[PDB]
Design a protein around this nucleic acid. Structure first.
Lengths: 31, 101, 203, 105, 8, 202
RNA sequence: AGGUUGACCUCGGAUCAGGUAGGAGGACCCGCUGAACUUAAGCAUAUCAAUAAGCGGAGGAAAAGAAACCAACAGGGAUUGCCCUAGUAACGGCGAGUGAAGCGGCAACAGCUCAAAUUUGAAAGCUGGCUUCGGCCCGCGUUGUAAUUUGGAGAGGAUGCUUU
RNA sequence: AAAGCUCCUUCGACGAGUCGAGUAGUUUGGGAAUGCUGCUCAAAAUGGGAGGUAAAUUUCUUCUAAAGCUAAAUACCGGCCA
């Protein structure tokens, strides 16, 4: 009865635009 | 904003800082009339008419029993402030009816 | 004053799992650090002042930086949570000092930030170049960007010629007068209004 | 089918480097959908409004003659939401409007 | 006319 | 659209047109079954703002519930203990009649999930409600990220556990000082306050 | 042919095509319902206790949750939990007793989605069936399926760089 | 094609038998200031709620209800492994 992987991974298009242009970046902070 | 005195007590008490003016937050716009909402409410008022207690208050205001209208409005609505606003609105309705007639 | 009149024995919580829970928390923190490396384990937090008259002497870390702080620091609000900056849209800057301090904090973080490109073969102009990408890093923003001065200095030396004269009449009398005026603000206003009405009537 | 043919022609024009407006003309249709028609009435774009007599719930159209009278729009109540649906290729239609037609009509 | 919003 | 006009009209429940519609619909719903399926929402603006869509997988069920208080099922309507200074005629059920309507509709359609519900009518005997339900096994529901949260098993029978809107109201899940005892859960908060905590180095 | 031929709406049938629910478990969790022994000299307020028993509904956690909050400060800033607040403010026959919260330190941190707007120069959306896997059909749906917006804003403008 | 930043004349929809009131029962430390439910009444547009002593008048401060989702830190006399 669990939702399929594709259906569970479906996102809204506004979310997709936000993730396309502002994903979680890789960064470091100088000591 | 009034500058604080730098004292722990008294009028305008408190630590002195440089107060800023803020652009008003959009959540604080609630209550403001918009043109479409005003238009739709006027049309719906014209279509639906009045409630029976509103007709009673309008009759009292026409007969000039203002205190009786306020007391009856408070009994019907529940609070003094809501009664006062409702009586002002119905007096406006009476005034526009008279200026139409 | 012993509150043992209910069935208290059904709701006794002992803490034998205290060292085990410390071990579990440390394992979770090490796993989180390994997943987040080379990013720091925490987000940058602003400096805010505690409310109420008991605690307004002391500063501490807040939830997140304000939108006006981010705007004055030049960090867009969609970019900020992706580079380890906490954002709080509820907090406002009522005064200039806290705003300036948090803007300087954001600028220091942005100056110490190393931003790796999304694609290694195609770096962008907002990205840190590879020959600056190698430097000593910190993994604890709560330590490297903590509250340096939670309280004001309690001791300060000045010259004897720079001793303030003091408020006229004395500090105790100034406090008494401020309290008295606060208690009599409305009585004096009513008396002035009555005097103005009498003067208008018998001018 | 007509839309598919039009989109094929526009895809051909895009492929040969032309705008879709070069091969497609401005359309003139009966306007439908209750929210759309109420918007057209409020913007005073509708020239003629036809309202079905049997909309259930009636509250969806009960304000429509008053709205049309306030905006100075000619309206008529007509029999058949199914009859209006035959105009707009649907089973039912609560309201239809005409804004503009062609020069020959 | 009554408009919900400015349109492009 | 027309839904702004519908909302403003639905505010005017004592006007002539709305009272006429309410009267005739109350008669019709009284002639129909106690729980029956509605072909469409009779209050489309209310249903839409509560989350109904005109999409396959959304259904509306209309239900009437007997109104008034609650009676304790004791023999001859009397108890055999200490005096209570009150009768069962004044006992008040701690949930809403809306919640009772939602639960009975959920039992009638056990394959669906109750999303929300809304008042449509009342008379002296009954209060009438329309309940929005979502089919978690329908493909159109499962493919939609705005609604397929309800396909997860944690939302089985929300109306039974008080996770609908009337359930949250009855559980008193609000912030602030007026809701000190209930905002995190009344029984859980009671257990937290009545737990004796003993540390090792005490 | 019009006493006909149809469009809809509502309501039914079918071992119709495809699905789904029930029972178990119930330590922990969300609700409902709900005592008495006890403690008050006895005892109808009270206490035991918003507890036991009874009933319904979940999961690996549940629940709560991104303020119609706290405050009154130089202001804090979703939720949860620990320490502290504090046996305090407060409630209480004839008194036995009862009893929070804000701040503060810490564990852990994460933010968002709709309704209300005309895509109107084009329902741009979707279940199902058949497939040569290209698509094609039966439909749903304008009594509104996509995109766009959610108050932190946003819509329209202006403007020149950035982004995938 | 979509996306962000900066500035602006203007525009800026925002959830109703609900909020609120009375009353009744129950509940709370909130037996002047608590929550829930039933019955009766029943809103508004800078409006509404809150600001723990009732009310009128004048201010001020804070959020923005009546639609919705969401990991972690928390519980665990059931089950499985140690």
């Amino acid at each position: 009865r669990r939702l399929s992987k594709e259906d569970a991974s479906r996102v809204l298009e506004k979310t997709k635009k936000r993730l396309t242009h502002f994903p979680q970046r890789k960064y470091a902070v100088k000591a | 904003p009034v500058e604080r005195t730098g004292l722990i007590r008294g009028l305008n008490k408190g630590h002195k800082t440089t107060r800023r003016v803020l652009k008003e937050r959009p959540s604080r716009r609630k209550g403001a009339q918009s043109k479409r909402t005003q238009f739709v409410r006027s049309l719906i008022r014209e279509v639906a008419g009045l409630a029976p207690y509103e007709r009673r208050v309008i009759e009292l205001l026409r007969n000039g029993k203002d205190k009786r209208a306020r007391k009856f409005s408070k009994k019907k609505l529940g609070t003094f402030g809501r009664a006062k606003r409702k009586c002002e609105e119905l007096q406006r309705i009476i005034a526009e009816s008279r200026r139409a007639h | 004053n012993n509150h043992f009149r209910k069935h208290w024995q059904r709701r006794v919580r002992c803490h034998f799992d205290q060292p085990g829970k410390k071990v579990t928390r440390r394992l979770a923190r090490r796993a989180k650090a390994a997943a987040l490396a080379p990013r720091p384990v925490d987000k940058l937090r602003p400096i805010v002042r505690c409310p109420t008259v008991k605690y307004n002497r002391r500063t501490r870390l807040g939830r997140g930086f304000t939108l006006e702080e981010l705007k004055a620091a030049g960090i867009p609000r969609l970019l900020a949570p992706t580079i380890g900056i906490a954002v709080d849209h509820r907090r406002k800057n009522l005064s200039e000092e806290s705003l300036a301090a948090n803007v300087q904090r954001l600028k220091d973080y942005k100056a110490r930030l190393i931003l790796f490109p999304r694609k290694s073969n195609k770096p962008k102009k907002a990205d840190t170049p590879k020959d600056q990408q190698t430097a000593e890093t910190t993994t604890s923003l709560r330590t490297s960007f903590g509250v340096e001065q939670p309280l004001a200095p309690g001791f300060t030396e000045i010259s004897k010629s720079e001793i303030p004269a003091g408020i006229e009449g004395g500090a105790y009398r100034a406090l008494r007068k401020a309290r008295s005026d606060a208690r009599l603000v409305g009585v004096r206003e009513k008396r002035a209004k009555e005097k103005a009405e009498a003067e208008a009537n018998k001018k | 089918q007509e839309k598919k043919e039009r989109l094929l022609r526009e895809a051909t024009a895009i492929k040969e480097g032309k705008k879709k407006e070069d091969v497609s003309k401005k359309p003139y249709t009966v306007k439908y959908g209750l929210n759309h028609v109420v918007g057209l009435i409020e913007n005073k774009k509708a020239s003629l409004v036809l309202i079905a007599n049997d909309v259930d719930p009636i509250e969806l159209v009960v304000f429509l003659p008053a709205l049309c009278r306030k905006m100075g729009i000619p309206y008529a109540i007509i029999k058949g939401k199914a009859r209006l649906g035959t105009l707009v290729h649907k089973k039912t239609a609560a309201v239809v409007a005409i804004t503009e037609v062609r020069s020959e009509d | 006319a009554v408009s919900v919003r400015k349109r492009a | 659209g027309a839904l702004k006009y519908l909302e403003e009209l639905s505010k005017k429940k004592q006007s002539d047109v709305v009272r006429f519609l309410l009267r005739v619909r109350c008669w019709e719903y009284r002639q129909l079954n106690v729980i029956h399926r509605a072909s469409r929402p009779s209050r489309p603006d209310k249903a839409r703002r509560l989350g109904y869509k005109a999409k396959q997988g959304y259904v509306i069920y209309r239900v009437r519930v007997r109104r008034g208080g609650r009676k304790r099922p004791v023999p001859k309507g009397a108890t055999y203990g200490k005096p209570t200074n009150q009768g069962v005629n004044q006992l008040k059920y701690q949930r809403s009649l809306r919640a009772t309507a939602e639960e009975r509709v959920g039992r009638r359609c056990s394959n669906l999930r109750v999303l929300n519900s809304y008042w449509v009518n009342q008379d002296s005997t009954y209060k009438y409600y329309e309940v929005i339900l979502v089919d978690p096994n329908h493909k159109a529901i499962r493919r939609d990220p705005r609604i397929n949260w309800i396909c997860n098993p944690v939302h089985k029978h929300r109306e039974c556990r008080g996770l609908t809107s009337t359930g949250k109201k009855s559980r008193g899940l609000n912030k602030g000082h007026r809701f000190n005892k209930t905002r995190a859960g009344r029984r859980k908060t009671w257990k937290r306050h009545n737990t004796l905590s003993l540390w090792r180095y005490r």
